[PDB]
């Protein structure tokens, strides 16, 4: 029940770069201390224990110092292997604490998103719902802003939007921005436009269709 | 490798019950204590419970402890954590972990269970995300599946039972009322499409619910 203070919260690296994760025990631990990394699928990997000493097969690329209070993990020179969530855990006092975490966040190159749009399918139609779809692909940074525009004006009400963490394999993001309307308001209006902004543009990524003519 | 598989999760009424399980095999059980580690939605790894192989010593953390209850059984190679007086701050995955953390594999379908603790299962309604303006990418076309309206999480989406793994992108659940939507897209060559069937497999075990979609032209 002693409380673990982790810092930063969160970071994006090039790959590279060395990377200080620090732990902070509100009352002594001795070095009771490890350092596990939480792999994108759930996985939960022990690094170092007895806050310096590695675990076997871990890359001598991580070590754990102690200094004071201070307990520090260093990834000198970040692989994109080592894409994950950083714990740290205390295992002197009977009730074990993990430290906040960090989310780390690969740095990389500009991306400018793929966007995509499906209008209602039949069987939604049916159903008296109209969801109009739109998947922003790969790009980069995280940060976008998708506006939804029914006719001429911008719809706010009625969107649903959800990101992807950070894809493993190529440092990238994608979002589906959703608008969903019932069968009413869709079938009595005709252009339905996505239009995304993104670091990577000066001018909005615009996908549209026109309802009309089945 | 040491695979160790965590197996009970579902929706539980709050006051409710439920007992976890977690298949630990790859290695000699009885010579390891073990771990329940749990984590909340938007929220990091909480440390849950301790039992060493004995089952002499046990450690339970000051929040579940008193409702929780961590059991193994070792010529069963199994660790249980039996749940009561279900908080909906009990909401969250579950992990099982040895002693030593040691970075294990997991089951085919993932990592963890989840439990969550609430109200009403509610079956999705999936629906294919044809293009007709759908727009592609470029020489390359993307397709879509959406799973709205259902409850509890989780629902497994694949494309064609799995077989089209490359260029898919589920975007996690997203909660609006109480219940959740939930879209795939898979981008293939304008050359796979239609030509080659592409399916939209989901399943939301919670309510046994399991359907196909086959993405046919049109938009």
């Known amino acids: 029940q002693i409380q673990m203070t982790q810092s930063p919260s969160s970071l994006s690296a090039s790959l590279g770069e060395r990377v200080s994760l620090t732990c902070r025990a509100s009352?002594?631990?001795?070095?009771?201390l490890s350092w596990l990394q939480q792999k994108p699928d759930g996985t939960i990997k022990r690094l170092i224990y007895?806050?310096?000493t590695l675990d076997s097969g871990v890359p001598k690329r991580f070590s754990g110092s102690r200094s004071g209070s201070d307990y520090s993990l260093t990834i000198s020179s970040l692989e994109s292997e080592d894409f994950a969530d950083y714990y740290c855990?205390?295992?002197?006092?009977?009730?074990?604490?993990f430290g906040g975490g960090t989310k780390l966040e690969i740095l990389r190159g500009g991306a400018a998103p793929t966007v995509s749009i499906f209008p209602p399918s039949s069987e939604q139609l049916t159903s008296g719902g109209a969801s109009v779809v739109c998947f922003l692909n790969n790009f980069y940074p995280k940060d976008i802003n998708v506006k939804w525009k029914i006719d001429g004006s911008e719809r706010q009400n009625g969107v649903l939007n959800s990101w992807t963490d950070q894809d493993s394999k190529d440092s990238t993001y994608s979002m589906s921005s959703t608008l969903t309307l019932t069968k009413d308001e869709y079938e009595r209006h005709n252009s339905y436009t996505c239009e995304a902004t993104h670091k990577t543009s000066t001018s909005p990524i615009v996908k549209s269709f026109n309802r009309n003519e089945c | 490798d040491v695979k160790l598989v965590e197996s009970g999760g579902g929706l539980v009424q709050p006051g409710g019950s439920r007992k976890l399980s977690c298949a630990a095999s790859?290695?000699?059980?009885?010579?390891?204590?073990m771990h329940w580690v749990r984590q909340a939605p938007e929220k990091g790894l909480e440390w849950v419970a301790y039992i060493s192989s004995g089952s002499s010593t046990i450690y339970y953390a000051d929040t579940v402890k008193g409702r929780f209850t961590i059991s193994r059984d070792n010529p069963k190679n199994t660790l249980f954590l039996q749940m009561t007086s279900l908080r909906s701050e009990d909401t969250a995955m579950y992990y099982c972990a040895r002693g030593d953390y040691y970075g294990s594999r997991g089951a085919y379908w993932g990592q963890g269970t989840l439990v969550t603790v609430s109200a009403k299962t509610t079956a999705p309604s999936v629906y294919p995300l044809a293009p007709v303006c759908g727009d592609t990418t470029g020489s390359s076309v993307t397709l879509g599946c959406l799973v709205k309206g259902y409850f509890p999480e989780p629902v497994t989406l694949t494309w064609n039972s799995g077989s089209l793994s490359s260029g898919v992108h589920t975007f996690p659940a997203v909660l609006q009322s109480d219940l959740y939507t939930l879209s795939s897209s898979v981008t293939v060559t304008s050359s796979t499409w239609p030509s080659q069937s592409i399916t939209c497999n989901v399943a939301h075990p919670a309510s046994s619910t399991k359907v196909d979609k086959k993405i046919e032209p049109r938009g």
């Open positions: 790859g290695f000699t059980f009885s010579s390891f204590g």
């Open positions: 007895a806050a310096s």
């Open positions: 855990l205390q295992y002197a006092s009977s009730p074990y604490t």
């Open positions: 009352q002594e631990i001795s070095g009771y």
